[PDB]
Amino acid sequence: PIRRACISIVEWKPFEIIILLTIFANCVALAIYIP
């Protein structure tokens, strides 16, 4: 349908970059945490 076609194009170059940046932010947030 239209939704599948419009969502199939939402993956391109900056998407991977922002995903990796979010992963790094999660890693540093876990590192900051102190038990």
Swiss-Prot record:
Modification after translation: Elevated levels of blood glucose lead to increased phosphorylation by PKA.
Regions that span the bilayer: 14-32
Tissue expression from the record: Detected throughout the brain, including hippocampus, cerebellum and amygdala, throughout the heart and vascular system, including ductus arteriosus, in urinary bladder, and in retina and sclera in the eye. Expressed in brain, heart, jejunum, ovary, pancreatic beta-cells and vascular smooth muscle. Overall expression is reduced in atherosclerotic vascular smooth muscle.
Localization per record: Cell membrane; Cell membrane, Sarcolemma; Perikaryon; Postsynaptic density membrane
Subunit note: Component of a calcium channel complex consisting of a pore-forming alpha subunit (CACNA1C) and ancillary beta, gamma and delta subunits. The channel complex contains alpha, beta, gamma and delta subunits in a 1:1:1:1 ratio, i.e. it contains only one of each type of subunit. CACNA1C channel activity is modulated by ancillary subunits, such as CACNB1, CACNB2, CACNB3, CACNA2D1 and CACNA2D4. Interacts with the gamma subunits CACNG4, CACNG6, CACNG7 and CACNG8. Interacts with CACNB1. Interacts with CACNB2. Identified in a complex with CACNA2D4 and CACNB3. Interacts with CACNB3. (Microbial infection) Interacts with influenzavirus H1 hemagglutinin.
Function of the molecule: Pore-forming, alpha-1C subunit of the voltage-gated calcium channel that gives rise to L-type calcium currents. Mediates influx of calcium ions into the cytoplasm, and thereby triggers calcium release from the sarcoplasm. Plays an important role in excitation-contraction coupling in the heart. Required for normal heart development and normal regulation of heart rhythm. Required for normal contraction of smooth muscle cells in blood vessels and in the intestine. Essential for normal blood pressure regulation via its role in the contraction of arterial smooth muscle cells. (Microbial infection) Acts as a receptor for Influenzavirus. May play a critical role in allowing virus entry when sialylated and expressed on lung tissues.
Domain characteristics, as noted in the entry: Each of the four internal repeats contains five hydrophobic transmembrane segments (S1, S2, S3, S5, S6) and one positively charged transmembrane segment (S4). S4 segments probably represent the voltage-sensor and are characterized by a series of positively charged amino acids at every third position.
Disease / disorder: Timothy syndrome: Disorder characterized by multiorgan dysfunction including lethal arrhythmias, webbing of fingers and toes, congenital heart disease, immune deficiency, intermittent hypoglycemia, cognitive abnormalities and autism. Brugada syndrome 3: A heart disease characterized by the association of Brugada syndrome with shortened QT intervals. Brugada syndrome is a tachyarrhythmia characterized by right bundle branch block and ST segment elevation on an electrocardiogram (ECG). It can cause the ventricles to beat so fast that the blood is prevented from circulating efficiently in the body. When this situation occurs, the individual will faint and may die in a few minutes if the heart is not reset.
Homology family: Belongs to the calcium channel alpha-1 subunit (TC 1.A.1.11) family. CACNA1C subfamily.
Name this protein carries in UniProt: Voltage-dependent L-type calcium channel subunit alpha-1C
Species this protein is from: Homo sapiens
